[PDB]
């Protein structure tokens, strides 16, 4: 089937759903996945309790 008539609006819906989730995260639980320890000046004199990546 041609891409324009169908697989544009479907991708539009997908991108809208992705935006729904993404603004839910941004606007209700901003620092959800991020570790709170980032909100602290980087002091090389103190190792954090647990060093973990994303």
């Amino acid at each position: 089937i041609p891409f324009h008539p169908y697989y544009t609006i479907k991708d539009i819906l997908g991108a809208l759903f992705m935006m729904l989730i993404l603004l839910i995260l941004v606007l209700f639980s901003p620092d959800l996945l991020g570790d709170p320890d980032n909100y602290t000046p980087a002091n090389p004199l103190n190792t954090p309790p647990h060093i973990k990546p994303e």
Partner: protein, 440 residues
């Protein structure tokens, strides 16, 4: 001799009406040859799912034998005096007409009176005609244009008797008992739904005398069709082995009434027609024709205005290779919207001249004149004089064409029918989106 004088010099077609309801019409001008024909209001539009194809079978058996004239003797009487007998049965009309000499008019009616009223319907003739119809259905299967048009009718009038083909399904043709044929003749060959047209050198008084003497015994003094519906769809028969790709796209147009036919027939005349074997080609006024000739984008294209009583199909049918269907769709749709949005006066004048030539060229010769008389009496209820046609053409201008095209073309769901290597045919969503212009 300034056209208008010639238009008013055309002899008029007097119309009379017998008690039975047969509408007798004649138009004598000079000729020693005449075309006399009975037009019935029967056809595939009236037959139900089981009677589909009965009209075709009746037309086939009409000439084979009658009651008064047993079998081939009928043909003898037609051949001995040089007359040419013919019959055609479209979806909503049937017609049996003979071309004969002016002298043979008294006989000419009689044979016709034998054919329409008292046929033979011999069982063995039915048995052989069944095989004849099956083979003819195969021939029509080989007819790619006719197959495409039948597909268009099926997909446009879906769920209505109009979608039924004239010949009927092959399964029906097998059963088709003689009782069904007799019933169909009884309830579809009645006197009120008959027009006895006669062109050429026939006197209306003589025609009335012969019709009264030969048609009085017919039924003197009920399913009468129903408004069909348009179902914008498409049927795609992907058959890649076929050489060319026949495509036909149509929209709901007007009927036999609804004078919008006159402007629309102008607009279609603007699009015109063209195939491989033509003249100027790239120099043709039609933008679609010029582009197709310049880029060799087609092997044929045509604009059709099939109009039934309650509705009709108005559109274009083109024949092109498998690698030019999409470009054809673009250009045809673009021409449609160009007419809808900005028609211009010069294009409308060209269309008016073309349509003026169409009617006068068509209404030449005894047979086309008689056919026009019958069709006009059945459909319009009257034979429209050429002067009235000229006036209706004159009243058409650019604004009227733009308005009617916007009414019938702009933003409408079309009915499409493709056959052959039609895989490049744009998806129905693309086709429908082509029927509205964002710029406008």
């Amino acid at each position: 001799a300034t056209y208008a004088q010639a238009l008013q010099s055309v002899p008029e077609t007097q119309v009379s009406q017998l008690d039975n309801g047969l509408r007798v019409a004649s138009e004598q001008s000079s000729q020693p040859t005449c075309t006399v024909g009975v037009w019935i209001d029967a056809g595939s539009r009236y037959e139900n799912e089981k009677n589909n194809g009965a009209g075709y079978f009746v037309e086939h058996l009409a000439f084979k034998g009658t009651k008064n004239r047993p079998g081939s003797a009928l043909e003898k009487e037609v051949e001995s005096m040089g007359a040419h007998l013919n019959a055609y049965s479209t979806r909503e009309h049937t017609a049996y007409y003979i071309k004969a000499l002016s002298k043979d008019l008294p006989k000419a009616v009689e044979l016709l009176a034998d054919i329409v009223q008292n046929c033979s319907l011999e069982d063995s003739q039915i048995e052989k005609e069944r095989d004849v119809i099956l083979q003819e259905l195969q021939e029509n299967d080989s007819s790619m244009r006719d197959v495409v048009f039948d597909y268009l009718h099926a997909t446009a009038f879906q769920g209505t008797p109009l979608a039924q083909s004239v010949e009927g399904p092959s399964e029906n043709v097998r059963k088709l008992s003689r009782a069904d044929l007799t019933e169909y003749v009884s309830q579809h060959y009645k006197a009120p739904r008959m027009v006895l047209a006669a062109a050429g050198g026939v006197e209306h008084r003589q025609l009335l005398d012969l019709a009264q003497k030969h048609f009085s015994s017919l039924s003197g003094t009920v399913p009468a069709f129903t408004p069909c519906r348009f179902t914008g769809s498409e049927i795609r028969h992907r058959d890649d082995a076929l050489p060319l790709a026949h495509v036909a796209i149509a929209v709901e147009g007007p009927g036999w009434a609804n004078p919008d036919n006159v402007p629309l027939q102008v607009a279609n005349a603007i699009i015109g027609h063209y195939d491989s074997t033509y003249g100027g080609g790239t120099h043709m006024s039609s933008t679609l024709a010029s582009v197709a000739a310049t880029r060799k984008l087609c092997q044929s294209f045509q604009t059709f205005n099939i109009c039934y009583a309650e509705t009709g199909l108005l559109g274009a049918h083109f024949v092109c290779d498998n690698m030019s269907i999409d470009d054809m769709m673009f250009f045809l749709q673009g021409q449609w919207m160009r007419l809808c949005t900005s028609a211009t006066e010069s294009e409308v004048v060209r269309g008016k001249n073309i349509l003026r030539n169409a009617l006068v060229s068509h209404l030449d010769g005894t047979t086309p004149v008689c056919e026009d008389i019958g069709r006009s009496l059945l459909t319009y209820g009257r034979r429209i004089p050429l002067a009235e046609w000229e006036s209706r053409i004159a009243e058409v201008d650019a604004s009227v064409v733009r308005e009617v095209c916007s009414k019938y073309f702009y933003d409408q769901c079309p009915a499409v029918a493709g056959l052959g290597p039609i895989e490049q045919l744009p998806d129905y969503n693309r086709i429908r989106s082509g029927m509205f212009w964002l710029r406008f």
